[PDB]
Amino acid sequence: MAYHSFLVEPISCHAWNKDRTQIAICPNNHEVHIYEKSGAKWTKVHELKEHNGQVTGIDWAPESNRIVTCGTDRNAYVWTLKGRTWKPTLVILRINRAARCVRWAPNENKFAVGSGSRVISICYFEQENDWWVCKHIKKPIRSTVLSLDWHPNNVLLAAGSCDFKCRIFSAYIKEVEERPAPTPWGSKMPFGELMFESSSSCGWVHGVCFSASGSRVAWVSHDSTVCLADADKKMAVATLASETLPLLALTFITDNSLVAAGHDCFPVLFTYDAAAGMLSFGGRLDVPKQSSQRGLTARERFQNLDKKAAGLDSLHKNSVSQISVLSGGKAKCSQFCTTGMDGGMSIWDVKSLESALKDLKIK
Amino acid sequence: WXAXCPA
Amino acid sequence: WXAXCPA
Amino acid sequence: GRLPACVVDCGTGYTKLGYAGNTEPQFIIPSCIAIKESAKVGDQAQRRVMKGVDDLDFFIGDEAIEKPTYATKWPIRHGIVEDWDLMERFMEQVIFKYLRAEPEDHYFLLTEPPLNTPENREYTAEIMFESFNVPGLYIAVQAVLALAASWTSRQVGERTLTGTVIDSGDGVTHVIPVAEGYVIGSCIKHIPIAGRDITYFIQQLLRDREVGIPPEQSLETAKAVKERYSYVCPDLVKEFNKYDTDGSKWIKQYTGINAISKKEFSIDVGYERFLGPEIFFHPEFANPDFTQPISEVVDEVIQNCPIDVRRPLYKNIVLSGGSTMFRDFGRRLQRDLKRTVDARLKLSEELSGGRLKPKPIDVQVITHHMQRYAVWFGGSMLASTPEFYQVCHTKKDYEEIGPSICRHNPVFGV
Amino acid sequence: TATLRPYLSAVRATLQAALCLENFSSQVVERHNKPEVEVRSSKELLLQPVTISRNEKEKVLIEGSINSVRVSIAVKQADEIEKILCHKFMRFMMMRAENFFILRRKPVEGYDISFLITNFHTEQMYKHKLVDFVIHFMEEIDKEISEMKLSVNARARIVAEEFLKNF
Amino acid sequence: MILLEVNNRIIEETLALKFENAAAGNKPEAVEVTFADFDGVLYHISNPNGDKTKVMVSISLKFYKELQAHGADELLKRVYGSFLVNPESGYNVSLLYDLENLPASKDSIVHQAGMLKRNCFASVFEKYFQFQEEGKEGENRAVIHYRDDETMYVESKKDRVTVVFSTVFKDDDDVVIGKVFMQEFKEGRRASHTAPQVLFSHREPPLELKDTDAAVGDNIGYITFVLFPRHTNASARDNTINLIHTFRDYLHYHIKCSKAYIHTRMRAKTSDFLKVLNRARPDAEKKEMKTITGKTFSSR
Amino acid sequence: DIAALVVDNGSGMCKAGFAGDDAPRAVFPSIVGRPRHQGVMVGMGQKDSYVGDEAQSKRGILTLKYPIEHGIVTNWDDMEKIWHHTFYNELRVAPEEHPVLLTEAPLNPKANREKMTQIMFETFNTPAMYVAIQAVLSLYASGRTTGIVMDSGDGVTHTVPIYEGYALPHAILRLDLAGRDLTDYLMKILTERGYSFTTTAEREIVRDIKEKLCYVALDFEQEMATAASSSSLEKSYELPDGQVITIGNERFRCPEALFQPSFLGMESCGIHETTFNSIMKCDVDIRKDLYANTVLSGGTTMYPGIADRMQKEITALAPSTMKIKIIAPPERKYSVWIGGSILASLSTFQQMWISKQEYDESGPSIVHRKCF
Amino acid sequence: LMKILTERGYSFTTTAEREIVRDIKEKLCYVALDFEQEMATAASSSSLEKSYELPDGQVITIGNERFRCPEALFQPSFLGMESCGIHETTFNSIMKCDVDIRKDLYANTVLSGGTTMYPGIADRMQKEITALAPSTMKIKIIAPPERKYSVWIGGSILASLSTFQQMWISKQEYDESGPSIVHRKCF
Ligand SMILES: Nc1ncnc2c1ncn2[C@@H]1O[C@H](COP(=O)(O)OP(=O)(O)O)[C@@H](O)[C@H]1O
Ligand SMILES: Nc1ncnc2c1ncn2[C@@H]1O[C@H](COP(=O)(O)OP(=O)(O)O)[C@@H](O)[C@H]1O
Ligand SMILES: Nc1ncnc2c1ncn2[C@@H]1O[C@H](COP(=O)(O)OP(=O)(O)O)[C@@H](O)[C@H]1O
Ligand SMILES: [Mg+2]
Ligand SMILES: [Mg+2]
């Protein structure tokens, strides 16, 4: 548990490697900065500069150690670590607007890039030509694709959009993997199929996430509502309308409990009751911290008496934009990392958070 | 005042 | 100074 | 009936006031304002709030330089108004004290340099339309009116509507090629090096060498030295040598009066006789950003205009403004331009193969009887015609569209 | 003040229900990043324009979006002198619209002033302090205009005394 | 400048220049200068029939008919002597200076030539001053059309002189500020122990304007001065005439300076609001020290 | 933002730095040395004027001259030398690119600041300057907008009372009595013991003795009777040539002159009574706020136990219900400079410069309009 | 004057030099008939400077100061005093009285005291009062040729009166009623 502010400008997106010893962040510009954990302090080890616009999606494949970065220059790059430097391989996305998000597949054989061209790009490799190619899922989509998360069976793909709908497409690529096994979502799974499409018509969808077992899909809306669709119950939707500001990211720490965050800057916890089909506000995870005041010197007193004649009680001073699971997977998580629009990186802990608050029960 | 006394 | 005291 | 339109040419070092229809400006005052300034602390927008009626305790023009207890401020720098409070007060005394015009019965014709930012025009429109409530305004470029001031001194039958106007005032020097009466705006050149830079250079020269000049007049002297003993040299190092070997003839004496004890001081005017004007043909002497002589700038101006209007433009280069009243200025300008043009023509002939010898381009620099106020008289022409009242921005146009009515001028497209 | 307290509380609560802005690149043009409420290019990134009014002629129109918020204020103007002073004051506010980073050089038609807070203003500057600035403007503008009116009255009296003194 | 002045600067400048050129012995040059003044007055200094030795200064006024009445030229004649000649075609009054018969002390005739409009006005106005001095009640009362939509109703009685300005401004902003500048005009009599009785009215015209053709309406304001025999005696009537003459122009002038006054307070309050906004910009942790120009410091 | 040089340059020691720091970058005694013997060893390099620390180190063969005396510049050539050494040798910065915030004591002749402006604009060509009053900067450094600053430099002492920012210019009390007079008095009284320092190179030794050993006695007569009845106050100082001297009674007799100038043959009141008079000249409604905000500064108020003496002396002159606080921070010597860096780093201060252009058109008479 | 002389560079601090400064004030100072105009004149010429010789041979020249010292009488704001000038003081003292007598006082203003021996103080006082008082009334400043001893002359005339011998405080009266008798015997 700690908080580290890498910079004062927002962090667009971050990604960790397998052993959670290095982090790749976006300093709110074209570069990708790879920092390494050295004892208790962070030290920048790599700078990846190939993009023309600011990066909007980074993802780090654990087993193969390949980074994928998509930015607003309509391009994607796959960085591989040659000796001591990261060399990029360009992927031809064939989109005509800025990309928005990128996600490796669980088996690291393909990756999905959601863009603002109203398409999803499933990119894979062609070792016959050393050619990173891509196919397009573009039928029921009518706006930007904001968030992606893959099913544990390497085929299905949850996608939230600015068209108010959360969908579950089938990203089956019949040239890199075998025909998948039937899931409670459907038995017919050709590429580009539509397995599920939410009924919401209000608020954009900032974040979607599959369960640890791939039987539940949860998402957050700008409508302040957090929803969860269960597949073992005829794809039934359980919604919870919050009374705070909207959420931007979420994750599955267990098969029953979610950890969301957003424009409130503090993580909240929700729970799912399968015996009733309804979400419950588990409550705020962070304990409101008391920020110490400092006495003013004479140089600073006059400097802010001439020029201008903390308010927030959490670690982050701006909205939280991305939540990842550090260690423990999604079946039983113990650490989750949050990055927001204040350049900070909060490594949380589930055990310490459950210890600090005894009114907090994780289903 | 105006005439007589001040005010 | 000029008058009073030196300076 | 109609009353004559007011013409107010506001320049950096001097403002010319008059009523359109006359032959010369009714007033030529310095563009300065004397206001009461004391030792205060705080911003400039905060110490300018005067209680009561104390914001009308100011003077302008000749009456603002005499006042020894007031602080004299110059609102216009490089032709661009940097202070709008002082400019509004200056305008209100220009209208209500000197011109004695009721600003609701007279169309106004103000002036501007080429590169005046559009926000300056919008502020001028806001001032003249909402504060003074003029029925119509017209902000014409300064040098384009200076062309129609050379017709009073040239023989009949050779008063052309095509020429390159060179206006060198107190704060800015701009070159405007007019062809057949249409301002070729995309070729206008604009250099912020002008008379006042010469006056700063001359005072810095005098202060490094001479002794006995009272500090409070160190500028007032460098103007009397510049506008009296200054000429143009055909060569610089040769002139330095001519001053070094025969100083007894080329070094003059200037005798001024210290206006506190009325004693007289005497200084020696030496190199600053020819180094002053030389910042026209060597602008790096005063501003290290520019490095291009004025002959080369004029040649670029004329060589960018359409082809079949290049030969008449070379024939009617009209000087204007005070800073061009230096002895043999036009002569050196024409000499350099003739050199450039003849060299280019010989190169074109050589490249052609040597079969035709084209007509040598006639280059002429026109000094006339009206240079010191050549702009204003031009305005006094334009603001005396009927068609003038068809190109002004009527009060209705402002009341409808707003100050953005005055946002366009012939230097930029769309 | 204390007569604008519920009106200002409602305006402030509606301001921090919007101003939850996010970065967003355009959809109708290749690589531009423009405020989506100013261009009105996509109708899916535009929230409902909500009006909060204290009476018929004092109101705030809030137009939200995914990376921008446009807050137009129609101020109280009781008589013609207050109208003239409010016009001139809003104009002198627009003149410096790069020192006010959240200001707009021209008000929305029908409204007296307009602020345009994009997402960069909420990433690089404090959000709650922007809300506080808007609410403080709405609190103090009436008072400042009334003091302008009193200044005009004092100027008129001084001018009258300066004339009638010479007789 | 608080109080407007009565002497025109262009006339004085031009005539002084001509008289300096003539007194030094230089040959006279041509002159043709046309200009204007307040209240729609039109001046023209020229030469009669290209005669470069004579300078004729003509003036066209708005009280055209009131000056042609019998006895309205006593002051003009008295002050201008032989300089007063027949009006130039299209103008109303005309002086004629011969550059070869100029008397000594050329400052006095130029000081009296710059006040041509003031003298034309005071000539048509001292009629009632005399009608009151001579102890006659019910003397002629008239309406001087000193402008084109505004009037000045003058009346002379046994013991007073009543002057009623019927005034109206052209612009809407000027009208709105003029309502205030005229409402607050009775608060001036607290600045002096001797000031003429001033009455303001815009609900209804006074009872003096019910037999006469002075401009009336629902957009016009009426300002009544009651000049008593301590403001119209033979020693303090010059100042009274100057003030009654330049009153409307002075009010217009100060209405138009009120805006340039208010602009400073508005700039101050704009800066005060910018200082409240500044609380939103997060203070930097380290700034790079620059130079007066703005370039890098180039040193520690 | 712009970097503006802050050059205190009071009498005694010149302290120059950049605006925005917490301590002056270069502090050196404002002296100018001149060789007073023939040069015989040619080829080693020689100079005809040493400035600052170099003149101090070589003081054995120089005639140290102070260009400033009692807060007034009396030799402008040496002042220009000092400024040149400050600009091009200590700070090593081009002066024609940075504004300059100089300081001047109150109630000095106007010709002083006039010639200062003329020198700074016509010799070094600074683009802008500003001449501030020392005590106002001292109050800036203390981080408060109300109080009476009591600045006792090396050549001049002065008090300035300020309330809510509105300084009262009719109660500013100046007193030409400071470290140099005390140094001369110590030179005088050191003879009675048996030591004679008479040359301007040994005045530096006497100044070091003063600022290392001298201190202020809380009760003068008690301390006199004590040090005159027992050898428990004597201290020994080693001259730069091995000799050791022992001073007893003199230790507190040197600074005591500050509290009763009758020792120096002067008529003016002590510094405590001067401060009390300055306070009493202000209106009755602010005195209580001044008593609790007395501020000391200058290197002459660095004597051990002077805050307690000033408190004990003012408390005897003020009503028994007023609380007397002597706010003496341990960084008092640099306070006048520290307030300067605070001032020149403000945003609105850019509107208070004297721009080179404004001077080029108005001569030196502009400082009286732009700077109070 | 001791304070403003430091502007020129002259420092008089000890009580012995206050007498020199007082001799300068009572030999060179004069009241200006128009303060702003005299200030503008003394700032654009050298015809207002006068040289005084200290009693050691040193010669000083004072210019603008000559009339800035007595001007404090008409503008105490220079001394940081809130009170009004002596002209407004006299006018207010007159206006405190009944109406019918305000005329006579206007024509019988009698200066007195040494401080009113400044050249040009009568004219300045007259101008100020006639600018304050109504225009009909007449203002006459009775500044006698001598007014340094006028109080003493009046005291002599009073003591030499024959009707005054019944108003002395007699020794027996003091021995009977103590000092406080001075509050009832004397007005
Ligand atoms: N005869 C002259 N010779 C040289 N310089 C002159 C002459 N007359 C004026 N100047 C310079 O030109 C400037 C004034 O000319 P002007 O055309 O009025 O400029 P502006 O119109 O911009 O004020 C001043 O800087 C003055 O020194
Ligand atoms: N810490 C100290 N203790 C005692 N005396 C000191 C101390 N510091 C400085 N002084 C003496 O005070 C005198 C004047 O102080 P100084 O700071 O030099 O004035 P200024 O600030 O004008 O340069 C110096 O000569 C020095 O000897
Ligand atoms: N001619 C003068 N000019 C200026 N000041 C004077 C003049 N004569 C006297 N004074 C000053 O006025 C003060 C009063 O003078 P005086 O008539 O002696 O009354 P008092 O006896 O109360 O002092 C004196 O202190 C003196 O300094
Ligand atoms: Mg010009
Ligand atoms: Mg000091």
UniProtKB/Swiss-Prot annotation, chain D:
Belongs to the actin family. ARP3 subfamily. ATP-binding component of the Arp2/3 complex, a multiprotein complex that mediates actin polymerization upon stimulation by nucleation-promoting factor (NPF). The Arp2/3 complex mediates the formation of branched actin networks in the cytoplasm, providing the force for cell motility. Seems to contact the pointed end of the daughter actin filament. In podocytes, required for the formation of lamellipodia downstream of AVIL and PLCE1 regulation. The modification N6-acetyllysine is found at K238, K242, K249, K252. The gene is ACTR3. Signal peptide: none annotated. Pfam families: Actin. It is found in: Cytoplasm, Cytoskeleton; Cell projection; Nucleus. PROSITE patterns: ACTINS_ACT_LIKE (PS01132). CDD domains: ASKHA_NBD_Arp3-like. GO terms for molecular function: actin binding; ATP binding; structural constituent of cytoskeleton. SMART domains: ACTIN. Disulfide bonds: none annotated. InterPro entries: Actin, Actin/actin-like_CS, ATPase_NBD. Keywords: Acetylation, Actin-binding, ATP-binding, Cell projection, Cilium biogenesis/degradation, Cytoplasm, Cytoskeleton, Nucleotide-binding, Nucleus. One of its GO terms (biological process) is meiotic cytokinesis. GO terms for cellular component: actin cytoskeleton; Arp2/3 protein complex; brush border; cell-cell junction; cytoplasm; cytosol; extracellular exosome; focal adhesion. It comes from Homo sapiens (Human). The lineage of its organism: Eukaryota, Metazoa, Chordata, Craniata, Vertebrata. This is Actin-related protein 3.
From Swiss-Prot, chain E:
Disulfide bonds: none annotated. It comes from the Eukaryota. Keywords: Acetylation, Actin-binding, Cell projection, Cytoplasm, Cytoskeleton, Disease variant, Intellectual disability, Nucleus. GO terms for biological process: actin filament polymerization; actin nucleation; Arp2/3 complex-mediated actin nucleation. The modification N-acetylthreonine is found at T1. The keyword Cytoplasm applies. It is linked to Developmental delay, language impairment, and ocular abnormalities: An autosomal dominant disorder characterized by mild motor delay, mildly impaired intellectual development, and significant speech impairment. Most affected individuals have microcephaly and may have mild dysmorphic features. Variable ocular anomalies include strabismus, cataracts, and cortical visual impairment. Component of the Arp2/3 complex composed of ACTR2/ARP2, ACTR3/ARP3, ARPC1B/p41-ARC, ARPC2/p34-ARC, ARPC3/p21-ARC, ARPC4/p20-ARC and ARPC5/p16-ARC. This is Actin-related protein 2/3 complex subunit 4. It comes from Homo sapiens (Human).
From Swiss-Prot, chain F:
It comes from the Eukaryota. The keyword Acetylation applies. It is found in: Cytoplasm, Cytoskeleton; Cell projection; Synapse, Synaptosome; Nucleus. Pfam families: P34-Arc (PF04045). InterPro entries: ARPC2, ARPC2/4. Its main location: cytoplasm. The modification N6-acetyllysine is found at K275, K295. GO terms for molecular function: actin binding; structural constituent of cytoskeleton. One of its GO terms (biological process) is positive regulation of substrate adhesion-dependent cell spreading. Actin-binding component of the Arp2/3 complex, a multiprotein complex that mediates actin polymerization upon stimulation by nucleation-promoting factor (NPF). The Arp2/3 complex mediates the formation of branched actin networks in the cytoplasm, providing the force for cell motility. Seems to contact the mother actin filament. In addition to its role in the cytoplasmic cytoskeleton, the Arp2/3 complex also promotes actin polymerization in the nucleus, thereby regulating gene transcription and repair of damaged DNA. Belongs to the ARPC2 family. Component of the Arp2/3 complex composed of ACTR2/ARP2, ACTR3/ARP3, ARPC1B/p41-ARC, ARPC2/p34-ARC, ARPC3/p21-ARC, ARPC4/p20-ARC and ARPC5/p16-ARC. Interacts with SHANK3; the interaction probably mediates the association of SHANK3 with the Arp2/3 complex. Interacts with DNAI3; this interaction reduces binding of the Arp2/3 complex to the VCA domain of nucleation promoting factors. This is Actin-related protein 2/3 complex subunit 2. It comes from Homo sapiens (Human).
Swiss-Prot record, chain H:
The gene is ACTB. ISGylated. MICAL1 and MICAL2 produce the (R)-S-oxide form. The (R)-S-oxide form is reverted by MSRB1 and MSRB2, which promote actin repolymerization. The chain holds residues 189 to 375 of 375 of the full protein. Belongs to the actin family. Actin is a highly conserved protein that polymerizes to produce filaments that form cross-linked networks in the cytoplasm of cells. Actin exists in both monomeric (G-actin) and polymeric (F-actin) forms, both forms playing key functions, such as cell motility and contraction. In addition to their role in the cytoplasmic cytoskeleton, G- and F-actin also localize in the nucleus, and regulate gene transcription and motility and repair of damaged DNA. It comes from the Eukaryota. This is Actin, cytoplasmic 1. In vertebrates 3 main groups of actin isoforms, alpha, beta and gamma have been identified. The alpha actins are found in muscle tissues and are a major constituent of the contractile apparatus. The beta and gamma actins coexist in most cell types as components of the cytoskeleton and as mediators of internal cell motility. The lineage of its organism: Eukaryota, Metazoa, Chordata, Craniata, Vertebrata. It is found in: Cytoplasm, Cytoskeleton; Nucleus.
